[PDB]
Design a protein around this nucleic acid. Structure first.
Ligand SMILES: [Mg+2]
Lengths: 208, 84, 100, 66, 266
RNA sequence: CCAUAUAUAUAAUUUUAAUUAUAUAUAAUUUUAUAUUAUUUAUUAAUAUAAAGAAAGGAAUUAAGACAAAUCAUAAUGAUCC
């Protein structure tokens, strides 16, 4: 009997990668006519099955390009061959019983927990009036901003409960929590809120 | 006539010259300065140009040669050296 | 015992001619038995060659050997080694076997 | 480049290796290359006739012909 | 046939995928009606329907552009005997010599494949991968088209020693036997090397010379004939001529393989 | 590994700060679709626009030279001295 190298690309730099790309090209070539229209294995994961140390990032990008081209084929016209080949490389909030959306936000060392219900724009902070708790107009406007982004100011009642940090931190925590609570009532507005900058935590904090 | 260089260690330009395009803000400023020089400062004639500058610099005040690479890549093909 | 899946210790696993023959059969397909039995080596040149370098002078050992089966096959091999002369002789034997 | 000897005489080198005992198994190509000898002449060949127009090269008309 | 496809209702119009399948059905049946095309060159066929060595004529070699040699200013004078003449500033290759050398090289490839040897198709120019891969697949051989690593033959342990190897029967059937580490780490050397661009692959030619690997190549007007065992005078810079010659050699190898299998099945 | 965002567990919500505490686990080096300009011209960068995004920061972790030391209080051993 005869000992021969397994792969047709044995004398290339990275025979495993070349052979795998050859199979992918063969499938992409047989079914070139099919029209078109979920992460893949990582670089180390493909290194294990390919060239290992010989694997190169350009080779990995080529693999991903072919895999994305094959996957992007229209699902209704795909078949068992393409899916079988590709399989080798594959790696809700609601209101409570009282109709309230509960959210928790943070800013600096301040934390806020807000109950947002449908109402007429009334707001309480720590059981106190907004103007009594927040003397600074800027903080009040910061709390208002997410409500007025979705133009729903005057349509919800807010019960905010803060602790930690100072005035501005508590106010902006109320802001972020109010945004997160508002997303529940109408998920379609989330992107709008997300584009206003009120749905992203301000990760900035005091550093040594 | 054609001049043929000897087999050279390299084919490279010492100082590749690139065509940076003069900033629009600078030329608009120059035009405004010439306007106020001729008609006068805050003259009615060229005041419109001022508006453009007020916009053009509003966001920011001011708003690459591959010859050596290609020469090095292609030299072995085009040098026309004798065979061996 | 706690042996790994494959040990490689020929005495504890739980010369020039032999290593030359094995490496040559591994790298080029030459027969080990022919090398070990039939070929004979005599070192022709053995010297020390030096190279200057900014940090210091570096010494290396150069060996030139000739191998042959005395029946019409002869080869010349040269070997360099900074570490030891024996390794230079080993490399020279390797090259001479390759140049038969 | 000089006319290269080693490229076309691979069969002879392999035969020496095999008969000496340095190589034990004949390569698969040995019998084929033995059956089909490589061309081992690299000679500049004279040309006496231009095929395109038939002009004959290498002819001198002697004095007697005129 | 076409799983995971949801047809449309009769009341509604065709979908995009239904239109695609409808047009495919039209194409496979009626689009080819009206005439049959004859005596027209289709490039893909040069890879998939190569002619046998005995059926090759000088006209067929000239149609592929095999005769068109390098510029007269880049002449390698050692290739004088292969040249028919010069025309329009380039040297013309003598296609009768090309036919003889090509038939000889095809016989060499057929013999090597019939003996079960390893055939390596090396060509590193831009668009040569398709023909190289098809030749290797139909000859049960191997190919390289990205780059020839220097030392692939003379330093095989440090280059190709890590890749896996395989025991196979006389009928090229996998045996799935477990190979010992020493067997896996041996050099596996090509029995025949064919080079499409020998001018840009001097390293491979020199390694084959050192390792005693007989080699075939397409020898253009500027290439050295004596660096290879079995030269093929022809144009190496045109993809059509290269693919024609490669297809001829690959068909010879396939014929040798088929003869081997036929004898093993009797 | 921190920090951040989430999930599970734990707490008979009087050790109450459940907005909390600390264990395990996940997540990102962000992913994409186009437009323009450059491009080794695409299976590329600069931006900008749109979409899914909580995702925006940080520390540590190796050797080779060369200089400086006796509050070298960053020590040991030795030399000498009472
Ligand atoms: Mg050429």
């Amino acid at each position: 009997r005869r000992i021969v190298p397994k792969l047709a690309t044995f004398y290339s730099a990275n025979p495993n990668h070349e052979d795998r790309i050859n199979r992918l090209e063969r499938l992409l070539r047989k079914y070139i006519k099919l029209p078109s229209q979920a992460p893949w294995i990582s670089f180390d994961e493909y290194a294990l099955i390919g060239g290992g140390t010989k694997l190169k990032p350009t080779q990995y990008t080529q693999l991903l390009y072919m895999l994305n081209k094959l996957h992007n084929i229209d699902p209704q016209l795909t078949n068992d061959e393409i899916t079988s080949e590709l399989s080798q490389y594959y790696k809700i909030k609601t209101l409570d019983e009282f109709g309230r959306s509960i959210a928790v936000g943070k800013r600096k060392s301040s934390t806020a927990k807000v109950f947002v219900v449908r109402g007429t724009g009334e707001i309480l902070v720590n059981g106190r009036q907004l103007n009594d708790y927040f003397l600074k107009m800027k903080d009040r406007e910061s709390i208002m901003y997410p409500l007025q982004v979705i133009e729903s100011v005057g349509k919800y009642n807010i019960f905010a409960t803060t602790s930690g940090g100072g005035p501005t931190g508590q106010a902006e925590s109320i802001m972020h929590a109010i945004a997160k609570a508002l997303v529940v009532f109408n998920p379609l507005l989330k992107s709008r809120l997300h584009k206003a900058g009120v749905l992203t935590r301000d990760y900035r904090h005091v550093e040594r | 006539p054609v001049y043929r260089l000897p087999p050279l260690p390299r084919l490279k330009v010492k100082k590749p010259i690139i065509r940076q395009e003069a900033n629009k803000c600078l030329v608009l400023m120059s035009n405004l300065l010439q306007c106020w020089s001729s008609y006068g400062h805050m003259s009615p004639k060229c005041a419109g140009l001022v508006t453009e500058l007020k916009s053009c610099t509003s966001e920011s005040a001011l708003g690459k040669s591959n010859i050596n690479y290609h020469a090095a890549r292609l030299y072995d093909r085009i040098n026309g050296k004798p065979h061996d | 015992n706690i042996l790994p899946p494959g040990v490689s210790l020929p005495n504890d696993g739980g010369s020039k001619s032999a290593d030359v023959a094995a490496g040559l059969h591994k790298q080029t397909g030459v027969d080990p038995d022919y090398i070990t039995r039939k070929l004979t080596m005599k070192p022709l040149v053995m010297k020390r060659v030096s190279n200057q370098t900014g940090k210091g002078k570096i010494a290396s050992f150069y060996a030139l050997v000739v191998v042959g089966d005395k029946n019409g096959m002869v080869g010349l091999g040269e070997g360099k080694s900074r570490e030891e002369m024996s390794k230079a002789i080993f490399k020279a034997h390797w090259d001479a076997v390759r140049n038969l | 480049m000089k006319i290269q000897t080693n490229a076309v005489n691979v069969l002879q080198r392999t035969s020496a290796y095999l008969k000496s005992g340095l190589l034990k198994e004949t390569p698969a190509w040995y019998n084929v290359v033995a059956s089909i000898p490589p061309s081992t002449k690299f000679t500049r060949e004279p040309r006496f006739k231009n095929p395109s127009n038939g002009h004959i090269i290498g002819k001198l008309v002697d004095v007697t012909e005129q | 046939p076409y799983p995971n496809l949801i047809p449309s209702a009769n009341d509604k119009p065709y979908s995009s995928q239904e239109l695609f399948l409808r047009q495919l059905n039209h194409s496979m049946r009626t689009a080819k009606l009206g005439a049959t095309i004859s005596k027209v060159y289709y490039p893909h066929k040069d890879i998939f329907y190569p002619p046998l060595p005995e059926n090759i004529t000088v006209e067929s070699l000239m149609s592929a552009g095999v005769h068109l040699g390098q510029s007269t200013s880049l002449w390698r004078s050692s290739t004088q005997s292969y040249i028919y003449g010069e025309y329009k500033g380039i040297h013309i290759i003598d296609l009768n010599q090309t036919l003889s050398y090509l038939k000889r090289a095809a016989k060499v490839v057929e013999g090597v494949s019939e003996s079960g040897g390893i055939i390596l198709f090396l060509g590193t120019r831009q668009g040569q991968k398709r023909g190289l891969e098809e030749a290797a697949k139909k000859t049960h051989g191997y190919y390289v088209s990205t780059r020839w690593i220097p030392g692939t033959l003379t330093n095989s342990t440090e280059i190709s020693g890590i890749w896996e190897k395989q025991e196979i029967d006389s009928n090229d059937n996998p045996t799935e036997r477990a190979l010992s580490p020493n067997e896996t780490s041996k050099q596996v050397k090509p029995d025949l090397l064919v080079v499409l661009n020998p001018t840009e692959n001097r390293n491979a030619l020199l390694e084959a010379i050192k390792s005693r690997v007989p080699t075939i190549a397409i020898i253009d007007t500027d290439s050295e004939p004596s660096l290879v065992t079995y030269p093929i005078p022809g144009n190496d810079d045109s993809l059509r001529s290269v693919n024609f010659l490669l297809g001829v050699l690959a068909r010879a190898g396939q014929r040798g393989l088929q003869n081997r299998l036929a004898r093993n099945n009797e």
